[PDB]
Amino acid sequence: CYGRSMATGKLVDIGEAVGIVAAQSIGEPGTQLTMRTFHQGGVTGGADIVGGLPRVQELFEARVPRNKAPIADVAGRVRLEESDKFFKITIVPDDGGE
Amino acid sequence: MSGRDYEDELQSERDYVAGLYARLDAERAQSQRRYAAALREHGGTAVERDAEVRALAKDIARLNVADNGLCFGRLDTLDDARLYIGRLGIFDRDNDFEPLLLDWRAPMARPFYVATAANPENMRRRRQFHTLGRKVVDFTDEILGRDIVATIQAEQDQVIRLDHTGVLVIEGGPGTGKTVVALHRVAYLLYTYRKQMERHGVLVVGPTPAFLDHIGRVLPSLGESDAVFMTPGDFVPGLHVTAEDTPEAAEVKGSLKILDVLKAAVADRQELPSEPIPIDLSDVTMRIDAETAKWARDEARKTGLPHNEARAEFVDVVTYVVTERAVARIGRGWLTRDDKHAWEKMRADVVGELEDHEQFNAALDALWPILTPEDVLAQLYTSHERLRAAGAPECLWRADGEAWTVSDVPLLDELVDLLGRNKAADEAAERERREEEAYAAGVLDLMVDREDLMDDEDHLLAQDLIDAEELADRFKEQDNRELSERAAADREWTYGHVVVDEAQELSEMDWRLLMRRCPRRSFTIVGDLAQRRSPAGARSWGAMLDSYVPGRWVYKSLSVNYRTPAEIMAVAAAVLAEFAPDATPPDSVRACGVAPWARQVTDDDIASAIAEFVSEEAGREGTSVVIGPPDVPGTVPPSETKGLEFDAVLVVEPERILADGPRGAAELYVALTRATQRLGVLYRDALPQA
Amino acid sequence: EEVGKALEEFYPADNPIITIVKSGATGNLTQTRTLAGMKGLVTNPKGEFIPRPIKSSFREGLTVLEYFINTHGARKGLADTALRTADSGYLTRRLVD
Amino acid sequence: LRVQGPREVQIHLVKEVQEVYRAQGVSIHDKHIEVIVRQMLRRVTIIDS
Amino acid sequence: SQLVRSPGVYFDETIDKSTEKTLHSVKVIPGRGAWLEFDVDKRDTVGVRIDRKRRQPVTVLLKALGWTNEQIVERFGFSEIMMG
Structure with missing residues (x-):
């Protein structure tokens, strides 16, 4: 299920620590990534998009994204309405109802 | 509207805006391409890459935002120099960077917020476009040029262009334009001090948010980020009890003579035992008496601190009291320790009774209960001796307390200033903060030490630029929301400005809470005194303001009437000529149509009357409502629609309206003069003054 | 950008400074532009851009303000x-x- | 997760992490992210014994 | 040699970690003696921090030097957070 080892090129062995390899492979290049500004104080720069190490810590902790978006609860079609600054969306199921 | 020239102009302007959005989408494309490229390799050093990214991200974000309502309006100068004003700079990179769209923050975008008809800068016309998200629905011209009209022009210029940064009142009245003038003034004021604003916030008070629909079509940067709408009944973060009006008990619970009650209402809860509630322990004897309870209640009152604040002092005093039986068993102690340590059992019983406490602590909760401010009122309205015990009259009585009205919301707020907080809740958050900081300290302990380095020359490490606290403070969820959500979720929030429409409907405690919100006393109060609905009301601005802004508050009153004919104005002026009129009718002019009519109904042909009225309203390009009480169908009273202009309105049954509440006379006076063209009154028998 | 373009064009292929790059041995064309073209824009200590660029290369030599x-x-x-x-x-x- | 299950959310997570690490020019075989995510969805909460 | 902050008065705007509100401050540092700070709080209440102790209000000081509310209101009064 793991597969083969990238070092040997042959199918992986029994007893091979494959979690430490994962941690290292993901962390080592962590300096090639954007980050949160290093300044003592200021305004939250998250107003703009920041999608490097922040996004990764987010996902690996499974906390709620900032620029969240809702996902379809049920397949079907969509009915879209717009008030002033508010979007309303209604999904109508193709087979079921409600 | 309804003109062909009007649609030709709509088409020209929609075409221009479509071109603008074309350029804007092209810019976004270019910016995302460069963004991805820079993120990928970028060649250069991390500082240059971070700079380039941050900058392109800023640009994108700005464009994404600007997608919603780009162009606010044209300015047609006195030299035919079309200046479109929006929320982004769009220039022609080829044509001498000739600007196609100005930013609303630009020195030549100024005669969109600080211009008038008497003192224009160089203008001939201004516009505003009604935008949904990016399509131009309609547009409203306003000639900044064109005796008697000059007087209105000058007065409005004085209200708008005024420099006080303080309290203002615009008690103009009907038909004279208080509302649009207040709108233009908020424009001026939040364009002129947008640096001191833009982070403190804004607050808007009134029934209809349609006043906050101007701040959003000329200053979108706030109408969707900063501004906060509230109604007298939403002041509290968590409930919107608005429809729950009340009879003249309001006057009682809407005037500061209620503060006394509140204090005494807690005094009626700083209770003492009816008989000594026995100490239920084996090897001691009850010392709890009205004696000790009296001593300790006086001690707690004597430090001048809210209830939950002095709970601790009360409990400590009671512990040092029970220290009596802790050491005064018969003469003193009587144990083999009381020759050198007279207090072995003193501070082994008294420092253990905070552990053997359930009986003690629970039977203490009778004499000093931790009040959540919702209950002090629930069980103040149900009872019948609490009202008198705390000073309240008996009208305030009611069975269900949780059925909250508009006039108990400021009381609920003041309760939080009168009570206090736990002061010991956040005890596990300290544990988690400490453990996160410890994990960060360990992160830094893992890293290479300056003395274990295997490099050529010493260099900067992270252990000499960052500590555990700040390293941990940046991996936190650190959730962020816009100013509106930060504010509405808070009561101690100091805003930067406060706009109040229909101000005559706020109780003294409402103004009190407001001024507790804005210490900077920057107000844009609008209202009228003759059109008051609530009985609490003000009846005088000095009554509400001289307690907070004495002799400093400015007051201006619009004088002339032009929007509403003088026929309807005399009708509603001789209507108002009753119940202490002291009539100050603004002089209406330019009435060049058919005088109103007054129709009768026999028993039930009123149904046919209103049917014809409604079926006909949408046959002439008109717009209005039908004014009546709640029982007649199709009619909606002015107590839900007062400050709205209309073309042709009807009023059914003046009498039941007039009698439905105390101040019906003004609720009628208003409704009569809300028509620019046509008026309609329906009666059966006779009219009192109409 | 135009300078880096014109510079990777003008340079021959037998040049060493371009050869060492296009061979994948070291370097980038950004450095070759900084050296023979223009350094370009630089950062403040805030991390923002100074809109007055460095039009000089480390071949021409930088002035005192540009170096600073x-x-x-x-x-x-x-x-x-x-x-x-x-x-x-x-x-x-x-x-x- | 509440919509799709314990096999699609793992894939959404892997895909997002690799989106990040790709926009920056970092190549990692997804099986490492697969390990890190398998070690994030390894337990159940009960309402019926 | 040593590089050090010269004595005097230094005013520093900043941002409140929680409210993200632009506020202000003042710090008076001598060559010898105690410091004297002033603040405009996140709630628009001016205050003082005599010898870096608890933040009590500012008019307290003004009075401790022999000032009458008439003076506090003639000198100030253009402002409305200070009166408050």
Whole structure:
């Protein structure tokens, strides 16, 4: 299920620590990534998009994204309405109802 | 509207805006391409890459935002120099960077917020476009040029262009334009001090948010980020009890003579035992008496601190009291320790009774209960001796307390200033903060030490630029929301400005809470005194303001009437000529149509009357409502629609309206003069003054 | 951008400074532009851009002001290169845990 | 997760992490992210014994 | 040699970690003696921090030097957070 080892090129062995390899492979290049500004104080720069190490810590902790978006609860079609600054969306199921 | 020239102009302007959005989408494309490229390799050093990214991200974000309502309006100068004003700079990179769209923050975008008809800068016309998200629905011209009209022009210029940064009142009245003038003034004021604003916030008070629909079509940067709408009944973060009006008990619970009650209402809860509630322990004897309870209640009152604040002092005093039986068993102690340590059992019983406490602590909760401010009122309205015990009259009585009205919301707020907080809740958050900081300290302990380095020359490490606290403070969820959500979720929030429409409907405690919100006393109060609905009301601005802004508050009153004919104005002026009129009718002019009519109904042909009225309203390009009480169908009273202009309105049954509440006379006076063209009154028998 | 373009064009292929790059041995064309073209824009200590660029290369030689304003972002890169290691270490310790 | 299950959310997570690490020019075989995510969805909460 | 902050008065704007509100401050540092700070709080209440102790209000000081509310209101009064 793991597969083969990238070092040997042959199918992986029994007893091979494959979690430490994962941690290292993901962390080592962590300096090639954007980050949160290093300044003592200021305004939250998250107003703009920041999608490097922040996004990764987010996902690996499974906390709620900032620029969240809702996902379809049920397949079907969509009915879209717009008030002033508010979007309303209604999904109508193709087979079921409600 | 309804003109062909009007649609030709709509088409020209929609075409221009479509071109603008074309350029804007092209810019976004270019910016995302460069963004991805820079993120990928970028060649250069991390500082240059971070700079380039941050900058392109800023640009994108700005464009994404600007997608919603780009162009606010044209300015047609006195030299035919079309200046479109929006929320982004769009220039022609080829044509001498000739600007196609100005930013609303630009020195030549100024005669969109600080211009008038008497003192224009160089203008001939201004516009505003009604935008949904990016399509131009309609547009409203306003000639900044064109005796008697000059007087209105000058007065409005004085209200708008005024420099006080303080309290203002615009008690103009009907038909004279208080509302649009207040709108233009908020424009001026939040364009002129947008640096001191833009982070403190804004607050808007009134029934209809349609006043906050101007701040959003000329200053979108706030109408969707900063501004906060509230109604007298939403002041509290968590409930919107608005429809729950009340009879003249309001006057009682809407005037500061209620503060006394509140204090005494807690005094009626700083209770003492009816008989000594026995100490239920084996090897001691009850010392709890009205004696000790009296001593300790006086001690707690004597430090001048809210209830939950002095709970601790009360409990400590009671512990040092029970220290009596802790050491005064018969003469003193009587144990083999009381020759050198007279207090072995003193501070082994008294420092253990905070552990053997359930009986003690629970039977203490009778004499000093931790009040959540919702209950002090629930069980103040149900009872019948609490009202008198705390000073309240008996009208305030009611069975269900949780059925909250508009006039108990400021009381609920003041309760939080009168009570206090736990002061010991956040005890596990300290544990988690400490453990996160410890994990960060360990992160830094893992890293290479300056003395274990295997490099050529010493260099900067992270252990000499960052500590555990700040390293941990940046991996936190650190959730962020816009100013509106930060504010509405808070009561101690100091805003930067406060706009109040229909101000005559706020109780003294409402103004009190407001001024507790804005210490900077920057107000844009609008209202009228003759059109008051609530009985609490003000009846005088000095009554509400001289307690907070004495002799400093400015007051201006619009004088002339032009929007509403003088026929309807005399009708509603001789209507108002009753119940202490002291009539100050603004002089209406330019009435060049058919005088109103007054129709009768026999028993039930009123149904046919209103049917014809409604079926006909949408046959002439008109717009209005039908004014009546709640029982007649199709009619909606002015107590839900007062400050709205209309073309042709009807009023059914003046009498039941007039009698439905105390101040019906003004609720009628208003409704009569809300028509620019046509008026309609329906009666059966006779009219009192109409 | 135009200068880097014109510069990777004007240069022959037998040139060593371009050969060492297009061979994948070292370097980038950004450095070759900085050396034979223009350094371009530089950062403040805030991390923002100075809109007055460095139109001089390290072949022409930089003036005094240009050198001074390059030092700004040249010092701001010695710490970053250290704090980034602590961030990486945080995430790596998490993953290894 | 509440919509799709314990096999699609793992894939959304892997895909997002690799989106990040790709926009920056970092190549990692997804099986490492697969390990890190398998070690994030390894337990159940009960309402019926 | 040593590089050090010269004595005097230094005003520093900043941002409140929680409210993200632009506020202000003042710090008076001598060559010898105690410091004297002033603040405009996140709630628009001016205050003082005599010898870096608890933040009590500012008019307290003004009075401790022999000032009458008439003076506090003639000198100030253009402002409305200070009166408050």
